[PDB]
Amino acid sequence: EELTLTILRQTGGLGISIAGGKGSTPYKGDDEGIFISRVSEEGPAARAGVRVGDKLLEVNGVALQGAEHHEAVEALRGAGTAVQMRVWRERETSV
């Protein structure tokens, strides 16, 4: 379930969108944290192995637990030309 991925920034950005964070509308009901809600199909994050629904645990070694949305966005924008992402990925979802 845990993966470390490295995304090479391009002109368009990192090729992801994020949702969630403390005080924001959650990405899913049972978790208020930061999630990758969109991955550009032909983009840098997709190439690095990022997938939709990944929970974003760290950016360049900094933990996002308890983080607000705005601070997570800033971390990604300020992460440089290569961005290390640590994620939690569900193999399957129980319903």
GROMACS .gro file of C-alpha atoms in nm:
model
   95
    1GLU     CA    1   0.000   0.000   0.000
    2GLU     CA    2   0.294   0.249   0.043
    3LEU     CA    3   0.486   0.380  -0.262
    4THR     CA    4   0.753   0.644  -0.318
    5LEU     CA    5   0.730   0.808  -0.660
    6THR     CA    6   0.933   1.085  -0.829
    7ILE     CA    7   0.759   1.325  -1.069
    8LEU     CA    8   0.948   1.537  -1.321
    9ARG     CA    9   0.779   1.876  -1.353
   10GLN     CA   10   0.697   1.994  -1.706
   11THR     CA   11   0.561   2.320  -1.854
   12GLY     CA   12   0.204   2.225  -1.756
   13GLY     CA   13   0.299   2.140  -1.392
   14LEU     CA   14   0.301   1.804  -1.212
   15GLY     CA   15  -0.006   1.672  -1.393
   16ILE     CA   16  -0.224   1.617  -1.083
   17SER     CA   17  -0.500   1.776  -0.884
   18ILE     CA   18  -0.546   1.738  -0.511
   19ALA     CA   19  -0.857   1.738  -0.295
   20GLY     CA   20  -0.918   1.740   0.080
   21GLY     CA   21  -0.730   1.872   0.380
   22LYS     CA   22  -0.825   1.992   0.725
   23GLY     CA   23  -1.123   2.230   0.704
   24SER     CA   24  -1.196   2.158   0.335
   25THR     CA   25  -1.463   1.939   0.184
   26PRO     CA   26  -1.321   1.585   0.215
   27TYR     CA   27  -1.237   1.369  -0.084
   28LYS     CA   28  -1.417   1.079   0.083
   29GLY     CA   29  -1.642   1.055   0.383
   30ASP     CA   30  -1.420   0.865   0.625
   31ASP     CA   31  -1.098   1.065   0.571
   32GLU     CA   32  -1.029   1.440   0.582
   33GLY     CA   33  -0.671   1.412   0.437
   34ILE     CA   34  -0.505   1.509   0.107
   35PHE     CA   35  -0.582   1.288  -0.194
   36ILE     CA   36  -0.479   1.287  -0.559
   37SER     CA   37  -0.816   1.342  -0.723
   38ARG     CA   38  -0.701   1.377  -1.086
   39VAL     CA   39  -0.400   1.254  -1.284
   40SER     CA   40  -0.339   1.388  -1.635
   41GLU     CA   41  -0.338   1.073  -1.852
   42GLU     CA   42  -0.045   1.184  -2.068
   43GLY     CA   43   0.135   1.381  -1.795
   44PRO     CA   44   0.435   1.365  -1.559
   45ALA     CA   45   0.263   1.215  -1.257
   46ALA     CA   46   0.106   0.940  -1.468
   47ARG     CA   47   0.452   0.854  -1.605
   48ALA     CA   48   0.595   0.846  -1.251
   49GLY     CA   49   0.325   0.595  -1.147
   50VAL     CA   50   0.084   0.819  -0.952
   51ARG     CA   51  -0.277   0.702  -0.964
   52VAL     CA   52  -0.613   0.863  -0.898
   53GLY     CA   53  -0.723   0.813  -0.541
   54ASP     CA   54  -0.373   0.790  -0.395
   55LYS     CA   55  -0.357   0.937  -0.046
   56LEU     CA   56  -0.069   1.186  -0.032
   57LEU     CA   57   0.136   1.118   0.282
   58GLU     CA   58   0.453   1.321   0.206
   59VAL     CA   59   0.599   1.572  -0.034
   60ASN     CA   60   0.982   1.584  -0.041
   61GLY     CA   61   0.987   1.410   0.295
   62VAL     CA   62   0.739   1.641   0.467
   63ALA     CA   63   0.436   1.470   0.622
   64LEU     CA   64   0.092   1.606   0.525
   65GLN     CA   65  -0.095   1.449   0.821
   66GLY     CA   66  -0.335   1.708   0.964
   67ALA     CA   67  -0.242   1.957   0.688
   68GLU     CA   68  -0.482   2.211   0.542
   69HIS     CA   69  -0.549   2.211   0.170
   70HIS     CA   70  -0.375   2.541   0.109
   71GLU     CA   71  -0.052   2.429   0.278
   72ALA     CA   72  -0.050   2.106   0.074
   73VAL     CA   73  -0.089   2.306  -0.248
   74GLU     CA   74   0.200   2.532  -0.146
   75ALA     CA   75   0.421   2.233  -0.071
   76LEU     CA   76   0.362   2.090  -0.419
   77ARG     CA   77   0.409   2.426  -0.592
   78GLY     CA   78   0.737   2.481  -0.398
   79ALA     CA   79   0.874   2.126  -0.436
   80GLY     CA   80   1.114   2.195  -0.726
   81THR     CA   81   1.170   2.039  -1.069
   82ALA     CA   82   1.163   1.682  -0.939
   83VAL     CA   83   0.904   1.603  -0.671
   84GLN     CA   84   0.920   1.299  -0.439
   85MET     CA   85   0.570   1.184  -0.339
   86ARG     CA   86   0.495   0.921  -0.075
   87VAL     CA   87   0.144   0.777  -0.113
   88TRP     CA   88  -0.095   0.521   0.043
   89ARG     CA   89  -0.277   0.327  -0.227
   90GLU     CA   90  -0.572   0.092  -0.165
   91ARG     CA   91  -0.548  -0.237  -0.352
   92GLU     CA   92  -0.928  -0.260  -0.344
   93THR     CA   93  -1.218  -0.089  -0.168
   94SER     CA   94  -1.452  -0.267   0.068
   95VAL     CA   95  -1.824  -0.184   0.030
   0.00000   0.00000   0.00000
